[PDB]
Structure 1
Amino acid sequence: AIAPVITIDGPSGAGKGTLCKAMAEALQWHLLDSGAIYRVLALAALHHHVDVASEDALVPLASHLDVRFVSTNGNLEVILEGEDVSGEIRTQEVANAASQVAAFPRVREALLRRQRAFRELPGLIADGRDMGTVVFPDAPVKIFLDASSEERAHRRMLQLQEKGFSVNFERLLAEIKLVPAADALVLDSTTLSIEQVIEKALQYARQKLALA
């Protein structure tokens, strides 16, 4: 501890990514995207020819993972060993290798330690599913972002469109149809606009970490 950490947990498509980036840029703090972490490990393995099925080989790789996340104008750059790999990480191939890598207990443990090492001054914004419950249970500010099925389905639709696939909203609404920390601030992405969620998250963080 010592360096402040703001955790953002919630289901897929709730807007965590957007909130996380906006907060990291507003406060100019470090950023950690746990969801992308496994894909980056998987890509490093493929790049270095580390056997995706060998737990023993994957652990050292995970423990020394050279990754950093940078957000500019809401655009996320994933720098693995000096090069931006944001595009590579979005492929199904990497997504599949990420599932293989994530299956091993010792690999998940090593990645747990590696994620905790992102906590440095002036601060860290971290988003995922268990950031405030498992990774940083002592985080001074914890936020749980919830959203309606429609909001989540719409966000998913736009995310796929980007990869080139345009899919029926009704189909996705069906496709989509995680415990908040006891000390988390609960924010609903559907009662408030995303701009309002960011405002309210920043105000809460300020009352807890600064102001006066």
Structure 2
Amino acid sequence: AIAPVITIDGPSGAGKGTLCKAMAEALQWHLLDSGAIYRVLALAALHHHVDVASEDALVPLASHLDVRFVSTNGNLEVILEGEDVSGEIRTQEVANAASQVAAFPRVREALLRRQRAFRELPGLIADGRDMGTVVFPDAPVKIFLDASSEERAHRRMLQLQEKGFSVNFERLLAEIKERDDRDRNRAVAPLVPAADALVLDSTTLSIEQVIEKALQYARQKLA
């Protein structure tokens, strides 16, 4: 009776965002960008002067985190307390704060019900780190999108250059190196692929190939 869910987990810069949107549109399903939740929580903490390195301080904020997401009128907008912060949550200051807040056990549990509420018919495409291992363990379809850290740093560099930002590959390689250690080195819902997850390594695959392989797999298990 419950709605089917396709989980897409993987490290930062693996291309989950792009894949999820493409699958959601292809199947006309709902989307959940769990990372945006942790980022909106982080931005909230910064604006409310809540200690980002304090589990006690963060828990209250997470439990009442006022965040809504708007459908695809073209893309997706993240709202915090009535204000669009879609761009601000994508800043390095918020990305860093987000990994900080997502590290605490009680803070993550305080966000479980909120993420799980996204499971609604006809289906949900869930993007994150632990969608297939903690949030939605029973997902009929689980995908682990991964790629070498070097490639993910290279793609990042290029995207920042497109936007007109001056970058340095060495810095980006360390940046993703540090994020990977966090998401993967924490006794609390670490980044690990589910045993039944399709491991999609996109290092030498194009956006088109990834989407094609993902949909082939998902459609296979759901019809």
| CA–CA separation in structure 2 for the residues paired with 1:176 and 1:50 | 25
TM-score normalized by the length of structure 1:
0.80
Alpha-carbon distance change, 52 to 122 in structure 1, aligned in 2, over 3 angstroms:
same
| CA–CA separation in structure 2 for the residues paired with 1:96 and 1:15 | 19
Unaligned runs of 5+ in 1: none
The match for 2:194 among 176, 181, 194 is 181
| CA–CA separation in structure 1 for the residues paired with 2:171 and 2:66 | 38
Question: In the alignment, what sits opposite 1:199?
Answer: 212
Determine helix, strand or coil for the equivalent of 1:179. Answer: coil
Q: Is the 8 A contact 1:21 1:71 kept in 2?
A: no
Cα distance, 1:171 vs structure 2: 5.4
Note the aligned Cα RMSD (angstroms): 3.0
CA deviation vs aligned residue, 1:44-77 (integer Å, no higher than 9, x gap): 3455566657655643442343434446487432
Cα distance, 1:89 vs structure 2: 0.9
Cα distance, 1:166 vs structure 2: 2.4
Alpha-carbon distance change, 153 to 57 in structure 1, aligned in 2, over 3 angstroms:
closer
Alpha-carbon distance change, 10 to 97 in structure 1, aligned in 2, over 3 angstroms:
closer
CA deviation vs aligned residue, 1:170-193 (integer Å, no higher than 9, x gap): 654566563211111122213432
Unaligned runs of 5+ in 2: 178-190
Q: In percent, how many aligned pairs have the same letter?
A: 100
CA deviation vs aligned residue, 1:135-155 (integer Å, no higher than 9, x gap): 111101000112234431222
Determine helix, strand or coil for the equivalent of 1:75. Answer: coil
Alpha-carbon distance change, 174 to 64 in structure 1, aligned in 2, over 3 angstroms:
closer
Cα distance, 1:125 vs structure 2: 1.0
Q: Is the 8 A contact 1:38 1:98 kept in 2?
A: yes
Count residues with an aligned counterpart: 210
Alpha-carbon distance change, 73 to 204 in structure 1, aligned in 2, over 3 angstroms:
farther
Q: Is the 8 A contact 1:142 1:183 kept in 2?
A: yes
